[PDB]
Amino acid sequence: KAVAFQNSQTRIIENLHDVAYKNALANPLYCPDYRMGKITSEELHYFVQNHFTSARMALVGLGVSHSVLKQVAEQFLNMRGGLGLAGAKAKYRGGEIREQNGDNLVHAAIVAESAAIGNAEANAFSVLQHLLGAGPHIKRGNNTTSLLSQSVAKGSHQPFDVSAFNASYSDSGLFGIYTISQAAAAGEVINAAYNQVKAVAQGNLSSADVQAAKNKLKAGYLMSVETSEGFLSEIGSQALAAGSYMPPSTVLQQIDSVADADVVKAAKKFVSGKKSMAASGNLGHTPFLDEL
Amino acid sequence: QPQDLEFTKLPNGLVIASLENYAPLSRIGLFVKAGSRYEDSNNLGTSHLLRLASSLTTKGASSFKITRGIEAVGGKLSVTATRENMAYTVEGIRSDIEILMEFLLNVTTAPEFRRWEVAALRSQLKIDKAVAFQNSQTRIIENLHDVAYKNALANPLYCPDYRMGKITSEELHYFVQNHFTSARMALVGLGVSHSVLKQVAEQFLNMRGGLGLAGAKAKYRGGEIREQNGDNLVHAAIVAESAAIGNAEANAFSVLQHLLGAGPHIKRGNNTTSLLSQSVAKGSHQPFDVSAFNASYSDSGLFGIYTISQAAAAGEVINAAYNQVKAVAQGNLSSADVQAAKNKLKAGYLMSVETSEGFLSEIGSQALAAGSYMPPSTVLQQIDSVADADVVKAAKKFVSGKKSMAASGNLGHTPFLDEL
Amino acid sequence: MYYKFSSFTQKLAGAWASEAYTPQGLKPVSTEAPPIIFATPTKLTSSVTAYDYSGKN
Amino acid sequence: TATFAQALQSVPETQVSILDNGLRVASEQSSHATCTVGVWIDAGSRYETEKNNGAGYFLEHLAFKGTKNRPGNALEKEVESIGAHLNAYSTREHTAYLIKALSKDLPKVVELLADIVQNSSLEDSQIEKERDVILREMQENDASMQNVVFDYLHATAFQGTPLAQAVEGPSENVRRLSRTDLTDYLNRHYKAPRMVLAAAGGVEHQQLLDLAQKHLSSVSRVYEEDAVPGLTPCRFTGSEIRHRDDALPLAHVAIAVEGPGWANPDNVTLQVANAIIGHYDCTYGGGVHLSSPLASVAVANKLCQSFQTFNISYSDTGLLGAHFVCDAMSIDDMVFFLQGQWMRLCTSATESEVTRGKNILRNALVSHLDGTTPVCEDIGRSLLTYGRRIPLAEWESRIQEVDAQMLRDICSKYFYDQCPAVAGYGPIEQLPDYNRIRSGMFWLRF
Amino acid sequence: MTNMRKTHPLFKIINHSFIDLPAPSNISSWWNFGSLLGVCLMVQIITGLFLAMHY
Amino acid sequence: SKWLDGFRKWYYNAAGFNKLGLMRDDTLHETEDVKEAIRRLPEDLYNDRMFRIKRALDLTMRHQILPKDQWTKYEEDKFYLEPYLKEVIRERKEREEWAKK
Amino acid sequence: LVANLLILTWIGGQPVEHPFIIIGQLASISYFSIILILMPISGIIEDKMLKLY
Amino acid sequence: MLSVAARSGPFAPVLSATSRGVAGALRPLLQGAVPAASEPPVLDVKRPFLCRESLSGQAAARPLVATVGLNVPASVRF
């Protein structure tokens, strides 16, 4: 947990998930501080016997015949309860948590609820995320095609990085802005990114820019399946999500089947929705939710 | 016989108060408007280390000389830090007084703040913060103050963990130069003559005469914090914005918190004459502790309910207390209950000034905020001039405003602010 | 909430609201705690004489 | 502009009357608007016959739960109709019920005091309710280690005598006592000539005496068997109890010798000796330059967490010693330093530390009597132990002739070459044996 | 696996006194006379043994 | 006077700690007062002092000295340990005076 | 002082006559004066010339 | 009724902090002492971000993934 919390982005996104959800998604990936020293083997046995059921598993294989998978699948996995526990439906909470740790840089993540996985608007949110900036393409570049980075570069004169953060889950989702900036200049960066998204929300965009975002999304999706690790990861994710393998060409034509009206609708949904903010750094000048 | 408390406003803004009890030992306090309210995020935790630097070296009196002299005369030197103001206090027997005051005045006047000394006792501030945070009510109160206010009153009484080792002498020097000025200082002497401390303050309190740095203007935001602590007991404070020090609505809120229950009056009692305690006792059948918490400052106040309950029975306790204060806010109360609340408040005020140290704290705060002390009789007649309609209006103001929640423990069944 | 009998010199010192006027805890019942005793098992018995030095009988 | 002794003599002395019942009524008037009125009864765990070992404690928990004229919680409604706090405590030799209130509701306070001390209605469901309450409370009190070591030191110091037994008693005495035992205890030990009605604050003696005549008359005035109960001198024996429990984070060790008693004046001298050693806590902002040598050694060597010194006096007996909490790896070293300090008080007590301890004791005696409640408590236990209220001027007069050679004579009489009683709890695996402590009680060549 | 030189009950004395003992780098030859004194004492006793066991 | 100053500068040059690059306050014998004089130094003076001692030991080990351009001349041998040592001596003296009475 | 001990060895070799008696007296008093008084006064002079005190 | 310790009944020593520089004659009730606090493990020095070019890519865009290997170091995917 200490090694995973050496980075600060993990702490920001876990505080953000603790803010945004009432239950069943506010639980962190890593152990809480009080939990270390009180986890017994009875809890692990309960977790395995009521969550590792046979109808919640996908056995995937690369470089191996299907009969061997059938033999292994019936010879080891064929004794289970069958369904296990259901869940708690992941109620949305909203709000903000700001912590003061005195770093040289200020992190701020401001999200709202988005479409879940399997919806037709999840692709619209992905297209909006690639339109607003979803990582660099050039080492030591300026990222001119991203609108948020260009708006803040028009605004500030200090080092920064602004991107759009999206996360699709089973029954809910999150979409918003991630900004890392200076201490005293955090408010201008946050306000400039929010006014850029607001100006997007009433439809100030071009179809060529949407086409560029679609091409970036298709290139990133095709590059995610290059290695065998990512290919097996997305095959297992699709097999656990819908229980049916879907070829990448259908995914590419599903990506191309979104319009800019859906992107404007997704931006308006983010603008008009309730917010969830996680902040860290020297927050003497970082704004609040009612100040945005 | 003990004479009247007599005051003096010096031309450099110094406030002087003195009374002659002809006591065997006297106490001398110095009250400065230099709390943790007057910091920003750049120099957080300055007030904690300045609070613990009461026995460091000064120009004219070293740490060894101060410690050995006060321990040889048997006197006591301490400091009480509120979020708004700080109070240095010395006490000792008659045959020594002036030299003890001299030591206290050195602690206020010229601390050079050597670097190796603060490097020595930053570990002491870590130890003191651990000792104070050993219990849960302090943690709940500082988390509630952090969430409720956005600026200038969210600063805790204790240095945060990231600053431990990052306070230098420059920030302490800036804090003393900007907030320890004579226009924000009151010298109070209980049991010692007026003329002696008056000429001492004439000859020695001539360092800074300005108003200093002020104008923080703390603002309110509300919100909610939940801390998964893991213990069986669940602590939950639900407050809202209330009137500041300097209004009759503050007296109405104090009457309201004494009506709703302001702590135990009985050793191992059941609190029959409290509405919140009656409501939770009607609801549940497990041990609890529900009280009304009021903390009013010179700019804003926080008023609400504070409950301690079990892990699985937090929600019914919170809902019962909120329904009880909602029933109060609809005017459903009797005048005998209001008279009992007024009697409890008057008895609590009169017993708060029983000891010399509480009375000295009261008259030092009255010398700071108002400039002169008024007798307790007009305080009781001010309390008795509070209408029950003002109590209903205060409860209606509490229920119709946005809320600040601070909860800690096993929070599986603790309701959110939206669920209320 | 004002005074509690403590301080090893048998004195009424100052305590808190939950310390002086609620000496009991907020626990539900007596949990599975380590047990207590205050009883020395030495079984020491002292017999005093208390005799008279006079009467010559 | 008066001096010390001209300011102690300006204190209003108390005034005491004695009724026909033997009820001794004492009052002190000040210039305050509030008052503290209480009843002190000479009935503690010293008088229990090892079969009703928690009877006074059960009665103290049952005193506020209902009386005959005010049955039930409506009782406390009346004392919450005036905003009056009420407290109670029970020691091994005393039982006190006191009310803090204003000066304008004194007859209600005296009436409720009489109704508490002589008309306590003991319900049958309240027996099991208070049984569960005191089981929870004794578990909660034994969750704090200082009281556990305190009761261990009493159990191992006065063993075989009725003073070693705890106030709450064992679990069997909690479970098996009924209403008949409490009735017998209140009939035998709540008699009239063992009660002090002490008032401190804005009250006068004539109105309090009239109220005591009206409400508190005819408490017992009887022995019911012509069998007068008394007190036997309880012997102090040297022993050592070690409650080894290595999962605890800190270790508490209390080492004591036999104190003289209440009526012996050299306690004052011994208090000066304790004022030489004093007390230390980890939150103390002194630093390295503390005056007391043991605390300075504890800070400089990073030994201690906290320590205190105690001089407890009961009827012709007591416990005088020290109690320290620290980690395990310090323990025995600190014992060495502690014993060394005591030997200094027998061998090399100078004149500056005697003056400093005298000033500390003057501040301790005057600073405690602030307000009404500690003054009333001092009045009650002074009339119960000394037989009179010792004025503060007499306290200063007794302090005045204490100098170095009588201090080292008294400390050699009480500390040197004695068998102490040691109690320990926690990681006490480095606590030395009784031979090392007994050998540290003396020196080879003085 | 453990280090033999730092865990042996007899060899930690000889390496703490002889092998990994930190000494100043700029020591001249004069300090070496002290070591010479030690071995001089030893050979004296050796000759002393030869001055008694045959004589 | 002037001749006393000249013989003082000549004695400073003939002392020989300027050949090793040492300053004057580096050569003080580390007693207890000197030890808490060093302990109260700031970090840069302490680091320069430790480097000067290590360079002096390195030059003494090979029986060599610095070149004459790198020697510590008289004007730059400032007294940095002097206020710390004098206040440590003063506080030790007043502690002894307190313990005497 | 070292050369004074060398002179003292040479004097202790030679028998008791003139002027080896007075060389012995002068060498012994020079030895005791160097060890007792001359070296601390020399150190005081050295510390005074170094602007130390 | 100023001096909010006298105004707030039960929460009087919680809103205010009392520190003693010189120990008085009376020892305080509830002395208290820290236990052995657990120490955090030692880590390396974090990589600083002093230029805008090295800050690119340091803002998260996709949810967290934690990977634990047997002979592979534990990785965090932003």
Side-chain angles (χ1 to χ4, degrees), chain B residues 132-172:
Chain B
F133 267 34
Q134 258 188 345
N135 56 5
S136 301
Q137 291 195 359
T138 304
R139 291 205 285 242
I140 282 296
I141 281 298
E142 311 315 329
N143 291 325
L144 186 67
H145 269 80
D146 186 31
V147 175
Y149 294 110
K150 37 168 61 168
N151 69 320
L153 263 175
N155 320 319
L157 276 300
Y158 304 92
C159 171
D161 303 318
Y162 80 103
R163 285 271 289 170
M164 302 205 148
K166 264 62 71 173
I167 297 96
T168 52
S169 286
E170 321 300 309
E171 281 158 65
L172 290 163

Side-chain angles (χ1 to χ4, degrees), chain C residues 14-42:
Chain C
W16 290 23
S18 64
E19 185 185 340
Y21 284 165
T22 305
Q24 62 212 26
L26 274 299
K27 322 286 166 141
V29 289
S30 171
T31 66
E32 200 159 359
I36 61 169
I37 203 66
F38 315 104
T40 317
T42 177

